[PDB]
Design a protein around this ligand. Structure first.
Ligand SMILES: *[C@@H]1O[C@H](CO)[C@@H](O[C@@H]2O[C@H](CO)[C@@H](O[C@@H]3O[C@H](CO)[C@@H](O)[C@H](O)[C@@H]3O)[C@H](O)[C@H]2NC(C)=O)[C@H](O)[C@H]1NC(C)=O
Ligand SMILES: *[C@@H]1O[C@H](CO)[C@@H](O)[C@H](O)[C@H]1NC(C)=O
Ligand SMILES: *[C@@H]1O[C@H](CO)[C@@H](O)[C@H](O)[C@H]1NC(C)=O
Ligand SMILES: *[C@@H]1O[C@H](CO)[C@@H](O)[C@H](O)[C@H]1NC(C)=O
Ligand SMILES: *[C@@H]1O[C@H](CO)[C@@H](O)[C@H](O)[C@H]1NC(C)=O
Lengths: 132, 118, 231, 231
């Protein structure tokens, strides 16, 4: 519980690690790793309303959580070059299990107004969707 | 800060000798220092979050810590360190040119093939 | 002896880090090495230099030429057609060179030190393996933190071809020895590999002691009837 | 061309496994034809038989001679001087080769595959490493269970020297790619290294699954009515 490696908010998974310089045998020590999963019991499969029933199966691949594909900057000789950081990021397309506090999620519903119909837009998470 | 773009911009040089002190070198009004003549300018591009200052004709005594200031309400003050390493410049120009009493001048300026895309 | 003609590709260290992709054309097997001919098909900056006719196997003179240029017409797929129409033969001969197609891109892997080097507390070894690339050219550098180490601190082998799973691919290795104390203090190291088939021309892997195979694992699964927002 | 004579130490594959200790005093580059004779300083009980000359660069030849002394007085401390004789530049050449001193032992490491390769269900790769040995002569073989794999299934590099503090030492690597079902079933593999400074002349290492497996795993299922996480 000391250094954060992964803090993922599409799946709501968090991985930390710490070198525990243990008491007995004081010239060797362990490496501990903590994983925390929070499982929502009322979310759907796709995040729209009538999709499919509530999700009952949750799968986590640690090779995908630890992935790193955004380009970085490296000073080699007296230069700045751009490099990648992973072997597998041939492509959003991932499925999310929870929401995220900092993003809107909307929908579209047709309702009637006497004559024709409209394409009324509906906020699914009302705190994060004010225009500001 | 983006919504404070109607301000005036400054550029320090942290002396640090007695207490700590920022003499100005250049402002956005159009004032430059005395001994920084011909080798300093402040540009408002790229704009919209950022401005740019260019300092050439470098020497080994230009190493120091430099601050950037605005006249806005709450100030971020960001600092950058300039280190001077060994090598030679990319572009290559001659020395200082004369001119005869009224005729055509011509000055070249080289660049390598890493700057061909630019 | 017997005359021959050759054309070699530009070196990868000046094509990737810089862009000055000079070419070279070489004829060997002459003893009157003043009367020679070189002609490429494009020549706009046509000052193709020639050098001193150095020796060869058992003291035969050898002439060569360099046509300067940079890396936009090479990587776009042009062609160069050096030819020798020297008067030491009565018939000329020709060769050409083009950027190789049918490429593959490598897979980079960094490996942690073995377990039985950590007992001695003297020095530990880090191995870098790059596999499966179709041309025979590669670059390998090392970094500590964000500082590049100088080239006299690690050993890099050569690039060889591996047992054939259908098509011909290559491999290369490299090792580096660091102090055992600052690996445990928490420094980070990186192996950087450059090859002309990668999209951004470079790729990097970074390893340290905390991002490794753990001894203890703690798993806690919490079930949240409340909300699905993940604060 | 210029005439020169060198002689070589016997091969390590014939000196550790087989029984074919052969020293080869040979001169290549001969202005005359095949008219040469060689004498050696020991007279152990065998005639240094010869072979016919060969084809070389532009008129030069290559004669040779093998001393059949495959009884090994080589590792006891002999000195084994050769001596040339030919209708050539009339000063008979001599050369001297002996077993080396100041020997060190190699240190052998066998590394597990990277986890990224493991989570893809294809071939997985293993790495052998030996470093710190004093003469640049070594043999690397592989095994699966007890069967030796044939040497067309794996790639091994040359033996180069490493940057260090005075005492010159050398290193070598090798790889081998196996199928994921053989790894996941539980079949083991081995890397085996032969050197002259090892007292029993061979070393083994072995690897499979469950090598760096963890020792403790805690699972906690926190039910509802207790959700108390923090930011
Ligand atoms: C998960 O659900 C969302 C929400 O329903 C899906 O996205 C939506 O998919 C529909 C059908 O593909 C899109 O409708 C299209 O609208 C355009 C006009 O903009 C029209 O040209 C098409 O004929 C069609 O009517 C809609 O745009 C799209 N996006 C939204 C609502 O933002 C999504 O595909 C679902 N994903 C999975 C993996 O099930
Ligand atoms: C300023 O930056 C914001 C955010 O990048 C962008 O949306 C906006 O269009 C920019 N304005 C101009 C004039 O480029
Ligand atoms: C350039 O040359 C002129 C010639 O007198 C001189 O006055 C001036 O100081 C020179 N400037 C620099 C930066 O050397
Ligand atoms: C390049 O050389 C090859 C053979 O060396 C031959 O096809 C021709 O001379 C050249 N190719 C083209 C397309 O001109
Ligand atoms: C052994 O080799 C050395 C080096 O050339 C030489 O000086 C010496 O005379 C040789 N000794 C014998 C017995 O051949």
């Amino acid at each position: 519980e000391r250094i954060v490696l992964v803090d993922n908010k599409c799946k709501c998974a968090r991985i930390t690690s710490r070198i525990i310089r243990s008491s007995e045998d004081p010239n060797e020590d362990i490496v501990e790793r903590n994983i925390r999963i929070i499982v929502p019991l009322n979310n759907r499969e796709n995040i729209s309303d009538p999709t499919s029933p509530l999700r009952t199966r949750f799968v986590y691949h640690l090779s995908d959580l630890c992935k790193k594909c955004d380009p970085t900057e490296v000073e080699l000789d007296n230069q700045i070059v751009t490099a990648t950081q992973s072997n597998i990021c041939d492509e959003a397309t991932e499925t999310c299990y929870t929401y995220d506090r900092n993003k809107c999620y909307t929908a579209v519903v047709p309702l009637v107004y006497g004559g024709e119909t409209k394409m009324v837009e509906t906020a699914l998470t009302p705190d994060a969707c004010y225009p500001d | 800060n983006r919504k404070e773009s109607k301000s005036i911009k400054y550029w320090c040089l942290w002396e640090g000798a007695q207490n700590g002190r920022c003499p100005l070198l250049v402002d956005s009004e159009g004032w430059v220092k005395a001994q920084y003549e011909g080798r300093l300018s402040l540009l408002e591009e790229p704009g919209n979050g950022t401005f740019t200052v260019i300092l050439n004709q470098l020497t080994s005594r230009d190493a120091g810590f430099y601050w950037c200031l605005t006249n806005g309400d709450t100030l971020w003050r960001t600092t950058v360190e300039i280190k001077i390493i060994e090598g030679e410049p990319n572009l290559k120009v001659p020395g200082n040119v004369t001119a005869v009493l009224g005729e055509t001048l011509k000055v070249p300026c080289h660049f390598p093939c890493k700057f061909s895309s630019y | 002896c017997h005359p021959r003609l050759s054309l070699h590709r530009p070196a990868l260290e000046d094509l990737l880090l810089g862009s000055e992709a000079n070419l070279t054309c070489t004829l060997t097997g002459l003893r009157d090495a003043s009367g020679a001919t070189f002609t490429w098909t494009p020549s706009s900056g046509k000052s193709a230099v020639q050098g001193p006719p150095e020796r060869d196997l058992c003291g035969c003179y050898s002439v060569s030429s360099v046509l300067p240029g940079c890396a936009q017409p090479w990587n776009h797929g042009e062609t160069f057609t050096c030819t020798a129409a020297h008067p030491e033969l009565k018939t000329p001969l020709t060769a050409n060179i083009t950027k190789s197609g049918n490429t593959f891109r490598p897979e980079v892997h960094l490996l942690p030190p073995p377990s039985e080097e950590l007992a001695l507390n003297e020095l530990v070894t880090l191995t870098c393996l790059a596999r499966g690339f179709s041309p025979k050219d590669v670059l390998v550098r090392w970094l500590q933190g964000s500082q590049e180490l100088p080239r006299e601190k690690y050993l890099t082998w050569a690039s060889r071809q591996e047992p054939s799973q259908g098509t011909t691919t290559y491999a290369v290795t490299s090792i580096l020895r660091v102090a055992a104390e600052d690996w445990k203090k928490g420094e980070t190291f990186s192996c950087m590999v450059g090859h002309e088939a990668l999209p951004l021309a470079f790729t990097q892997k970074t390893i340290d002691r905390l991002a490794g195979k753990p001894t203890h694992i703690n798993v806690s699964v919490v079930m949240a009837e409340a909300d699905g927002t993940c604060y």
